Structure 1
Amino acid sequence: MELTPREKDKLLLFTAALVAERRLARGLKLNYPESVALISAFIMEGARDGKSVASLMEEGRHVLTREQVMEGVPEMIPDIQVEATFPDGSKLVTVHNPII
């Protein structure tokens, strides 16, 4: 595989997201770290699929709503950022006010 440090680091994000994903499935209101990991992982898969940066900046605001997260959580996340390999290389996706 020849995994570089950055690829191994992202495995940590992916795994953190598996945790949140299961908790949401049980119907729990997600906390701060769970919310960030869940939305971040979503974006990385979007880049893998070949979606554009512009599309993801929008789609990322519709992953979790205010009623699926704990109180105060939406305000603790004014934005979310993550980079991934798009067909045209690494790019940064910034999602402003992801939880509404």
Structure 2
Amino acid sequence: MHLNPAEKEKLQIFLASELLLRRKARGLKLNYPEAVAIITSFIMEGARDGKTVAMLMEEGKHVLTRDDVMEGVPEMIDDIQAEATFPDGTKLVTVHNPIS
């Protein structure tokens, strides 16, 4: 596979997001690391899908809403940043105040 250090680490975000998604599906209000993992993986998968950085900056604000998360979590997350390989190489996505 030729995994580099970043690829190995980023697998763990996908796994955390899968864990978090299962928790959300059984009715739990998500906590801080769960919410960050879901949004982060969505961005990385969006890059893989070929979306633009601008599309993901927009979409990342609509992945989770306040009713999906515990009290205070929206205010704990000022931004979520992720780097992924777009069709035009690695780019940084910053989602500001992802959960209102």
- Give the corresponding residue for 2:20: 20
* Residue-by-residue CA offset, 1:42-80 (whole Å, 9 max, x unaligned): 011100010000000000000000011000000100110
Deviation sequence 1:22-44 (CA, Å, 0-9, x none): 00111110000000000000011
| 2:36 equivalent to 1:4 | no
**How high is the TM-score relative to the length of structure 1?**
0.98
Report matched runs for 1:46-65 at 5 Å.
46-65=46-65
Query: Which residue matches 1:85?
Result: 85
Report the aligned-residue RMSD. Answer: 0.5
CA deviation after TM superposition for structure 1 residue 21, in Å: 0.6
What code does the residue aligned with 1:76 have? M
Residue identity in the other structure for 2:54? A
Task: Kindly provide the amino acid, as one letter, of the partner of residue 64 in structure 2.
Answer: L
Aligned 1:65-80 pairs, distance under 5 A: 65-80=65-80
Paired residue secondary structure (1:62):
coil
Which portions of structure 1, spanning 4 or more consecutive aligned residues, are displaced by more than 6 angstroms? none
Where 2:95 maps in the other structure, the secondary structure is strand
Amino acid at match of 1:54: A
Q: Distance in 2 between matches of 1:2 and 1:81?
A: 25
State the identity %: 74
How many Å apart are 1:99 and its aligned residue?
Answer: 0.2
**Runs of 5+ in structure 2 lacking a partner?**
none
